[PDB]
Amino acid sequence: CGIWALFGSDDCLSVQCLSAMKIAHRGPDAFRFENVNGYTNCCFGFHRLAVVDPLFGMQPIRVKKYPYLWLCYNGEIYNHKKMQQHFEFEYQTKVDGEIILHLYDKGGIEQTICMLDGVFAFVLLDTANKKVFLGRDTYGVRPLFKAMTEDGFLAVCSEAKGLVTLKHSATPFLKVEPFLPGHYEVLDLKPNGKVASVEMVKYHHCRDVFPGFEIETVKNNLRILFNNAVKKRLMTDRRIGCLLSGGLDSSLVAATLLKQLKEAQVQYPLQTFAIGMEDSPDLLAARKVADHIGSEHYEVLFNSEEGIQALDEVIFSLETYDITTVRASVGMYLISKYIRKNTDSVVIFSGEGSDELTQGYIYFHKAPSPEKAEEESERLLRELYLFDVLRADRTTAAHGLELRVPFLDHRFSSYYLSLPPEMRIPKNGIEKHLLRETFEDSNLIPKEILWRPSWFKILQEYVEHQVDDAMMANAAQKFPFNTPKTKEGYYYRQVFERHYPGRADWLSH
Ligand SMILES: *CC(=O)CC[C@H](N)C(=O)O
Ligand SMILES: [Cl-]
């Protein structure tokens, strides 16, 4: 789903009905645009991918009980039903996000956002109390960007590409920035439709309704929490599929997912999707897992020429120029295209978050202590929204698919992060050893995969021809912010700057 909203606009009917369409790709099933009674220079645009409640879930969500609340969100509130039941709320729709309205009316914004077990970016307008609220989930899984002017014009969107062509009177340049994960903002609505920020607030989770850490207890809890993470993510009336690369993380996801689909008596085969250059070791690993779990497996072969040819639109989708991110996004974009083209799988499970959470990257083998390693894991998790989780969202949403990432489950990730730092560093000499031991009695995946530790070259050779030595020598002059250090870096930056000239500070690093 793609959200777009303006408060305090000059003209949000004629010229900005057209700006709401820039993020259509995220939500192919339906579009609604509307303005606000009494505040007709404030408006919403919503592109829906209908995942829960096809008939009654169109947004802005507006229900009879709360005539002055307007909610637009991209997300999934996995614990909505148990809150609904505990508090005995009566829904008008059947959509998970309606819980946000009932909780807000009861307790305000802070006490609402801390209760949501899920992923989300939202905008909530309350015309009785004269407030606008922005919010984003803890790890930043679902995206949000914002722009605000001194006169009190506010514009928000799922992707920066829906903000950069807005023209506000008396601002020659509209500054666009990511909205920070794990924050809410409160803004005052003024009588003429402009807004003024009150506070931007970091929130933590609340309730919705050495001593210990023995290894058998830790492994048992991790199994249960991971299973729960996947189970709560079966919430959808659409077909669930799964990316399956043959790596440990996607394999554990695929295998646990199929087991949970069976327990729920789901009647469709699980479709799994791998992509690579043919005769890859990774593709054979993926096929091995597929046969072990019994999925309906699609193996997609990408061509060097196809990959290079996709860079332009991939960087357009991503809105960043980080080398690691751009490299990996080409394959994810192309597999997502294939999924949308060839199947009806819409809710796509993936393994992002695991490496950051479990200290799985090779360089963690060189960490000065368990506390310096633990700290680095915390920085990686805080920055996911710029990197791996940016890639995972932008490249699936580019083709009208919905990403789900169970490693970033709130209860599972919190429990793992609570573990003594010394149970989490590699003691045997293999990364993610605890994670592997957790699942070794399950027969969940083949033991060979459970214990396993030139697209890159083709990109080098291509950018070598596109960036000459003088361009590189001149790089600090042409690109003074986050200057590129390689020709690969330089090339991605040029593509980025052609789409988003002057926007390089979306990436801090
Ligand atoms: C596209 C999206 O965020 C889904 C919103 C809600 N869960 C739904 O309509 O399925
Ligand atoms: Cl998720």
Author numbering: 1 to 209, 222 to 465, 479 to 534
Anything the authors wrote about it?
Asparagine synthetase (ASNS) catalyzes the ATP-dependent biosynthesis of L-asparagine in cells from l-aspartic acid using l-glutamine as a nitrogen source. Several recent findings provide evidence for connections between asparagine biosynthesis and human disease, raising the urgency for in-depth studies of human ASNS. As seen for the bacterial homolog, human ASNS is composed of two domains. Residues in the C-terminal (residues 203–560) synthetase domain (41.6% identity) are more conserved than those in the N-terminal (residues 1–202) glutaminase domain (33.9% identity) based on sequence comparisons of human ASNS and its homologs in a number of model organisms.
In order to determine the molecular basis for the binding selectivity of ASNS inhibitor 1 and to provide a firm basis for future, structure-based efforts to identify potent and selective ASNS inhibitors with simplified molecular scaffolds, we determined the high-resolution crystal structure of human ASNS by X-ray crystallography at 1.85 Å resolution. Conditions were then identified that gave a single crystal of the DON-modified enzyme, which diffracted to 1.85 Å resolution. Two molecules of DON-modified human ASNS were present in the asymmetric unit as a head-to-head dimer in which the two monomers were linked by a disulfide bond that likely forms during crystallization. A cis-proline (Pro-60) linkage is present in the human enzyme identical to that in the structure of the bacterial homolog AS-B. Electron density for the DON-modified Cys-1 side chain is clearly evident in each monomer. A hydrogen bond network, composed of the conserved residues Arg-48, Val-52, Asn-74, Gly-75, Glu-76, and Asp-96, which mediates substrate recognition and thioester stabilization in the hydrolysis reaction that produces ammonia, is also clearly defined. This substrate-binding pocket is located at the interface of the two domains and is within 5 Å of an absolutely conserved glutamate residue (Glu-414) in the C-terminal domain. After refinement of the protein and ligands, a single 12 σ peak remained in a pocket at the interface of the N- and C-terminal domains on both chains. The site is surrounded by Tyr-78, Arg-416, Arg-245, and Val-417, and the peak was assigned as a chloride anion. Importantly for structure-based inhibitor discovery, the synthetase site in the C-terminal domain, which is composed of sixteen α-helices and five β-strands, is well resolved.
